Nucleic acid binder design. Structure first.
Ligand SMILES: [Mg+2]
Ligand SMILES: [Mg+2]
Ligand SMILES: [Mg+2]
Ligand SMILES: [Mg+2]
Ligand SMILES: [Mg+2]
Ligand SMILES: [Mg+2]
Ligand SMILES: [Mg+2]
Ligand SMILES: [Mg+2]
Ligand SMILES: [Mg+2]
Ligand SMILES: [Mg+2]
Ligand SMILES: [Mg+2]
Ligand SMILES: [Mg+2]
Ligand SMILES: [Mg+2]
Ligand SMILES: [Mg+2]
Ligand SMILES: [Mg+2]
Ligand SMILES: [Mg+2]
Ligand SMILES: [Mg+2]
Ligand SMILES: [Mg+2]
Ligand SMILES: [Mg+2]
Ligand SMILES: [Mg+2]
Ligand SMILES: [Mg+2]
Ligand SMILES: [Mg+2]
Ligand SMILES: [Mg+2]
Ligand SMILES: [Mg+2]
Ligand SMILES: [Mg+2]
Ligand SMILES: [Mg+2]
Ligand SMILES: [Mg+2]
Ligand SMILES: [Mg+2]
Ligand SMILES: [Mg+2]
Ligand SMILES: [Mg+2]
Ligand SMILES: [Mg+2]
Ligand SMILES: [Mg+2]
Ligand SMILES: [Mg+2]
Ligand SMILES: [Mg+2]
Ligand SMILES: [Mg+2]
Ligand SMILES: [Mg+2]
Ligand SMILES: [Mg+2]
Ligand SMILES: [Mg+2]
Ligand SMILES: [Mg+2]
Ligand SMILES: [Mg+2]
Ligand SMILES: [Mg+2]
Ligand SMILES: [Mg+2]
Ligand SMILES: [Mg+2]
Ligand SMILES: [Mg+2]
Ligand SMILES: [Mg+2]
Ligand SMILES: [Mg+2]
Ligand SMILES: [Mg+2]
Ligand SMILES: [Mg+2]
Ligand SMILES: [Mg+2]
Lengths: 201, 64, 143, 117
RNA sequence: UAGCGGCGAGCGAACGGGGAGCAGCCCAGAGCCUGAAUCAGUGUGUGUGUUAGUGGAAGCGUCUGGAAAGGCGCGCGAUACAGGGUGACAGCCCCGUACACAAAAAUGCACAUGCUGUGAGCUCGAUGAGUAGGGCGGGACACGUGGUAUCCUGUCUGAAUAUGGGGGGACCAUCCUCCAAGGCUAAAUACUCCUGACUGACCGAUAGUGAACCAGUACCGUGAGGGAAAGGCGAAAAGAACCCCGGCGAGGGGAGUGAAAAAGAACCUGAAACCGUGUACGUACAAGCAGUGGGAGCACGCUUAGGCGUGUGACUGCGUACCUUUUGUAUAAUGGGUCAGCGACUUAUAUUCUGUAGCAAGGUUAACCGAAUAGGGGAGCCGAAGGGAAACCGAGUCUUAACU
C-alpha cells in the first residue's frame, strides 16, 4: 500500500493486510458496541422490598376484614413499596477478543483510506502552545473536525489542543474505534503510520 | 455459580466417546441362586442408556 | 462511514421474549407456563433427577468402580505435538517446558496420531507400536 | 430508565373513547366500559357485513314477489321462467326496475310467461 | 475434580501453578567486648499537605421581541469551550475553571537531627512437663466413627527430652523433612457514622432515603415501637392605589402593575372521572347487555342546482357484558363503583443448544501490571483418541483361556 502525503508529497508503504483489506461491518459494529458498553459506568441502585425501611407486621389480619389480603406494607404493589426487581451496581464489560479488536481496527483503517479521510503528514509541530496558532494552522490545512494521532509525544500539542472543542490529539497506541470512526478527518503522522504497522503487523 | 454435579450420577455413569452414557446393570447385587445363569451372564457387561433417560442424566451430569 | 450507519449482520441480534405483555405478544397472560401447575407457580419446578416419588435412574442403577490416582497424572502426546517442542529431543521436562502435558504429569505416552517429519529422539517415554514404528520410519531413536 | 407512562395511556384511552362517542350512558365516558362497547360494536360490524347481503336479498325477493303477483305470476314461476328464457338479470336490478319503471317489469313478466308456457 | 453423604438433599478441598505484597527478630543466661545497630517517647530546622484566601484572558452594530444569551454581519481570547447564574440558548455580562501564587498560628507527614530511656557485638552453654502421646465423651478441619490421618479439650492417666521426638491420611519397617509444649512483628486485605473533589445510557415529587418543606415532626400506642401527607405566581412583589355591592366581614366588579391576573397567593401547564349551563335533534302506547345493518324526517355547513358531509335517529332485521376457572357460562359461579398515577418473567455466575462474527488443529485468556477499554500475562481451560472398574493398551480396546 502506497500512501501519498500532502505537505511533503512523499509515499509510505504499508502492507494491504494492515491498510488494504475489506470493510467488515458486523465486526466493527460489535467492537463499537462493546466500546460504548465498556464506557458505561453503571452505578444505579433501587430499594428492594428487603431494603425498604419499614415494619414487618401484617398491617391488618388476614381473614375478617373487608380489605384485601396483605401481609407486608413494604410490598412492591403498594405505595412507597419496593421496586419489584431492584437493580444493583453491576459490570457490563463486553469482552471482544484480541484478534477481533485488531480486525476491527484494520477494517476501519482500510475504510478510512478507501473513503479518503486519513491525511498523512511527515510531522505535526507548533512552536509555543498557543491554541490560536493551532486553529490558525488547522484553518491553513483546511479542516474543521480533525483527529491528529501523533507519531511521538508532543506535550506542546497536548496543551494546544486541550481547549479546542473539535480537535483531538492522541497516541498511535491509545487509539480507539469510536474516535477513529466519529472524527471526520483523521490526520496521521508518518511515525504513527510506522507505529501502527508495527501495532497490527 | 458453577453447576453442582449430582455425585450419585457421577458415581454411576460414564460418558463415552461419541456422547452416550454407559452404566452397570440392575439386579446383580443379592439374591442370586434363584436367578438363572444366563440372566447373570447378560447382566454382567456394562451397557448404554436409552433414548429418553439420557436427557435426565445429562441434567444430573452437566460437566460431561 | 459515520458512527450511526454501523448496522449489524442480519441475524445477529435476536428479539428476546417478553413474557406476559398482551394478546398480540404471543406469550400471553400465562407466559409460556400453562395453567395452575407446579411448573406455573412462581419459583416452581422440580430438582434434577426427579421422576415423581419413584426412584430416579441414578438411584435404580448400581455403582461401579473407583478412580485411580495414577490416571489424571498420565497424559497422551500426539505425534504432531513432537514438532512443537524446540530442540529435537523429547523428554518430560522438555515437554512440560514446551506446554504439552502440564506440570502435574509424571508418566506419558506417544500415540500414532498426526504426521511427524523431522528426526526426533524420544527419551524416557513409553511409546506404542504404531507411533514407535512411525518414529523409527521418520529417523528417531526410541529408548 | 424509569419509563413513565402517562402519555401512552392518555393516547390509547383517547383513541378508544373517540371511537366510543355517541353511545348512551357511562359507555361513552368510562374507559373500562367503552372498551367493551367498542369491541362488541366491532364484533357486530363484522357480523353485519355478512348480514346486510342476507337482508337485502330478502328485501329484493319480497319486492319482486309483490310486483310479480301484481302482474299475475308467483315469484318461483317467475324466476324459473327467466332462467328458461336465459336472462341473467339479477334481482337487485329486477327490484329496482320493479319500483322505478314498471312497464319494463311487465315486459319481463311477459317474456317469463312466454318462456314458461 | 479427589472425597464426605438416611451415599439421599446437598456439603466440597488440597498438592500444584500464576499474581498482589514480601521483614524478620527476642526471652528461654553467663562471662567479655562496654554504648556503636536499634526502636519507643520528648524537641530545634527544611520541605510538603490541610484549616482562611489572591490574580485570572477576550464583543460589538442591527431585526424579532416584554426582555436577546436568538437570527443576521463583522471581530478577539483560549495551558481557560468543566460548570453555574444573568428578563429567551453567552468562550468574550458576572461568579468561576486552566494556570500562577499566598499562611503570623496549629498542624498530618518525609525527614535534616538534637535529648531521654535503649543496648548492638563476640564466645560458650542452655533447646519451654502433669507436656507430647493414651482411654472415654464432644468439637474444627470438605471428612457425619467410617479402615480415619491431623488439630482443640470436659475427665482419668502420662514419658523420652538432639543417639531424642513430631509428621509424611489406619498401621509397621527404611528413607525424606522438621524441631511443639514462651513471645513480638510493617505491608498487600475488609469497612464508611463521617470530611472534601468528581462522575452517572441513576430518580425528577405515588419516583429518589421515610423525609426536596421547621420529619422520625404531626399522629397512634401505657411501652418497646409504628409513622404519614405536604415542591413550583413572576424575570423583579412590581402581592391589586382608588371607587362600588356587602355586615367598617367573606366574596366579587371596574381601575392599576403586568409579556401575561382565563399567572392574584385556594397562584406555571390544568387532562380524566364528576357536577352544571347554553344550542341543534330525539323522547310521555312504550318492553330487555342499550349496539350494529338499514332508514325517513329535522337542523347546520359547503356547490355545475344535482352533490354531499357533520349532529340527531323515529321505525326496523339481528343481537343474552368483560375477565378468570372450566367438560361447560347471560349465568342466579369469581373480581371490578369510575377516573388518574404506581403494579407482576429481571439480575449475577456456570452449563447446553441455535443464529451470527473472529481464528481455524488450533481457539482463548482470568487475576495482575499498565493514567489504564490499548499492550503485556498462555498460569490455565476446551478440542485434535478411544477402550477399561483399574494397571495398562492405543486406532483400536474390553470381555474371554481364545474370540471368526
Ligand atoms: Mg414480629
Ligand atoms: Mg411515602
Ligand atoms: Mg421507594
Ligand atoms: Mg487485554
Ligand atoms: Mg457385589
Ligand atoms: Mg398461543
Ligand atoms: Mg390463572
Ligand atoms: Mg388443572
Ligand atoms: Mg401444568
Ligand atoms: Mg416466592
Ligand atoms: Mg414410594
Ligand atoms: Mg501449561
Ligand atoms: Mg424520568
Ligand atoms: Mg365527554
Ligand atoms: Mg350469501
Ligand atoms: Mg478571586
Ligand atoms: Mg475573569
Ligand atoms: Mg420565557
Ligand atoms: Mg522447643
Ligand atoms: Mg515449663
Ligand atoms: Mg496430658
Ligand atoms: Mg492430649
Ligand atoms: Mg490418637
Ligand atoms: Mg477423640
Ligand atoms: Mg501430634
Ligand atoms: Mg504414607
Ligand atoms: Mg407533579
Ligand atoms: Mg416522597
Ligand atoms: Mg375585599
Ligand atoms: Mg383547587
Ligand atoms: Mg415558566
Ligand atoms: Mg392555574
Ligand atoms: Mg377534566
Ligand atoms: Mg310517540
Ligand atoms: Mg323499560
Ligand atoms: Mg349507516
Ligand atoms: Mg370449579
Ligand atoms: Mg381447558
Ligand atoms: Mg351460551
Ligand atoms: Mg353475574
Ligand atoms: Mg342478575
Ligand atoms: Mg373460586
Ligand atoms: Mg376473578
Ligand atoms: Mg363485588
Ligand atoms: Mg387505571
Ligand atoms: Mg411495569
Ligand atoms: Mg446461556
Ligand atoms: Mg463459527
Ligand atoms: Mg472390535
Amino acid at each position: 500500500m502506497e500512501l501519498v502525503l500532502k505537505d511533503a508529497q512523499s509515499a509510505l508503504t504499508v502492507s494491504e493486510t494492515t491498510f488494504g483489506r475489506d470493510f467488515n461491518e458486523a465486526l466493527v459494529h460489535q467492537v463499537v458496541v462493546a466500546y460504548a458498553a465498556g464506557a458505561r459506568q453503571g452505578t444505579r441502585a433501587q430499594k428492594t422490598r428487603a431494603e425498604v425501611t419499614g415494619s414487618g407486621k401484617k398491617p391488618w389480619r388476614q381473614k375478617g376484614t373487608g380489605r384485601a389480603r396483605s401481609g407486608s406494607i413494604k410490598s412492591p404493589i403498594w405505595r412507597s413499596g419496593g421496586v419489584t426487581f431492584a437493580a444493583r451496581p453491576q459490570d457490563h464489560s463486553q469482552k471482544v477478543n484480541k484478534k477481533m479488536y485488531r480486525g476491527a481496527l484494520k477494517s476501519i483503517l482500510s475504510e478510512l483510506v478507501r473513503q479518503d479521510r486519513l491525511i498523512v503528514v511527515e510531522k505535526f509541530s507548533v512552536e509555543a502552545p498557543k491554541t490560536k496558532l493551532l486553529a490558525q494552522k488547522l484553518k491553513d490545512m483546511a479542516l474543521e473536525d480533525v483527529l491528529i494521532i501523533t507519531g511521538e509525544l508532543d506535550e506542546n500539542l497536548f496543551l494546544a489542543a486541550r481547549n479546542l472543542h473539535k480537535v483531538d490529539v492522541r497516541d498511535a497506541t491509545g487509539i480507539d474505534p469510536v474516535s477513529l470512526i466519529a472524527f471526520d478527518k483523521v490526520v496521521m503522522t508518518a511515525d504513527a503510520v510506522k507505529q501502527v504497522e508495527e501495532m497490527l503487523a | 455459580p458453577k453447576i453442582k454435579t449430582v455425585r450419585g450420577a457421577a458415581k454411576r455413569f460414564k460418558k463415552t466417546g461419541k456422547g452416550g452414557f454407559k452404566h452397570k446393570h440392575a439386579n446383580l447385587r443379592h439374591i442370586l441362586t434363584k436367578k438363572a445363569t444366563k440372566r447373570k451372564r447378560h447382566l454382567r457387561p456394562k451397557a448404554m442408556v436409552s433414548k429418553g433417560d439420557l436427557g435426565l442424566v445429562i441434567a444430573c451430569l452437566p460437566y460431561a | 462511514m459515520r458512527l450511526n450507519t454501523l448496522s449489524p449482520a442480519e441475524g445477529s441480534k435476536k428479539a428476546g421474549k417478553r413474557l406476559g405483555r398482551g394478546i398480540g405478544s404471543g406469550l400471553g397472560k400465562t407466559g409460556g407456563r400453562g395453567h395452575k401447575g407446579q411448573k406455573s407457580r412462581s419459583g416452581g419446578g422440580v430438582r434434577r433427577g426427579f421422576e415423581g416419588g419413584q426412584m430416579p435412574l441414578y438411584r435404580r442403577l448400581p455403582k461401579f468402580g473407583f478412580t485411580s490416582r495414577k490416571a489424571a497424572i498420565t497424559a497422551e502426546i500426539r505425534l504432531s505435538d513432537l514438532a512443537k517442542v524446540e530442540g529435537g529431543v523429547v523428554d518430560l521436562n522438555t515437554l512440560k517446558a514446551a506446554n504439552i502435558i502440564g506440570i502435574q504429569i509424571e508418566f506419558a505416552k506417544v500415540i500414532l496420531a498426526g504426521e511427524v517429519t523431522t528426526p526426533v529422539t524420544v527419551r524416557g517415554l513409553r511409546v506404542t507400536k504404531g507411533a514407535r514404528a512411525a518414529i523409527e520410519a521418520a529417523g528417531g531413536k526410541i529408548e | 430508565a424509569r419509563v413513565k407512562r402517562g402519555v401512552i395511556a392518555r393516547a390509547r384511552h383517547k383513541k378508544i373513547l373517540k371511537q366510543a362517542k355517541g353511545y348512551y350512558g357511562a359507555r361513552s365516558r368510562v374507559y373500562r366500559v367503552a372498551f367493551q362497547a367498542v369491541i362488541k360494536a366491532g364484533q357486530y360490524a363484522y357480523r353485519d357485513r355478512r348480514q346486510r347481503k342476507r337482508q337485502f336479498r330478502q328485501l329484493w325477493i319480497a319486492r319482486i314477489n309483490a310486483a310479480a303477483r301484481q302482474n299475475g305470476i308467483s315469484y318461483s314461476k317467475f324466476i324459473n321462467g327467466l332462467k328458461k328464457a336465459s336472462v341473467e338479470i339479477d334481482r337487485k336490478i329486477l327490484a329496482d326496475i320493479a319500483v322505478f319503471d314498471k312497464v319494463a317489469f311487465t315486459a319481463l313478466v311477459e317474456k317469463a310467461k312466454a318462456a314458461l308456457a
